[PDB]
Amino acid sequence: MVTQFKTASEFDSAIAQDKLVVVDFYATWCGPCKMIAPMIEKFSEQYPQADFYKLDVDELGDVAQKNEVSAMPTLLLFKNGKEVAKVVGANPAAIKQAIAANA
Structure with a gap:
C-alpha cells in the first residue's frame, strides 16, 4: 500500500515501533x-x-x-520510531537498497 501525511498525529505512529x-x-x-x-x-x-x-x-x-x-x-x-537514513532522491538505485540494508 501507500499513503501520505497531513497531520503529524498520523506519521507519529508510522515510525513509532513499526519497522522501517x-x-x-x-x-x-x-x-x-x-x-x-x-x-x-x-x-x-x-x-x-x-x-x-x-x-x-x-x-x-x-x-x-x-x-x-x-x-x-x-x-x-526511520526505524522503530527513530531514524536510520536520508537520501533525497528515489531514483532506481538507492531507494531500493536503502530499504534493504535498513529493513
Whole structure:
C-alpha cells in the first residue's frame, strides 16, 4: 500500500515501533514530484515488511524543515520510531537498497 501525511498525529505512529518506514518529503511545489507517488507504492511490493508513506511539504512543511529536507522530492527512513537514513532522491538505485540494508 501507500499513503501520505497531513497531520503529524498520523506519521507519529508510522515510525513509532513499526519497522522501517519510507516516507518521502516531496516539495509542495516541483514538477515531476507526483510521479513518485506510484513509485513509492511499487516499492511496497518488494519490502512489504516496511511501510511506504509520504510526507506533505505543504501541510507538514515543518517536518520538512525539522529534518532539514526541503528538496523535491526526498526520501526519509526511520526505524522503530527513530531514524536510520536520508537520501533525497528515489531514483532506481538507492531507494531500493536503502530499504534493504535498513529493513
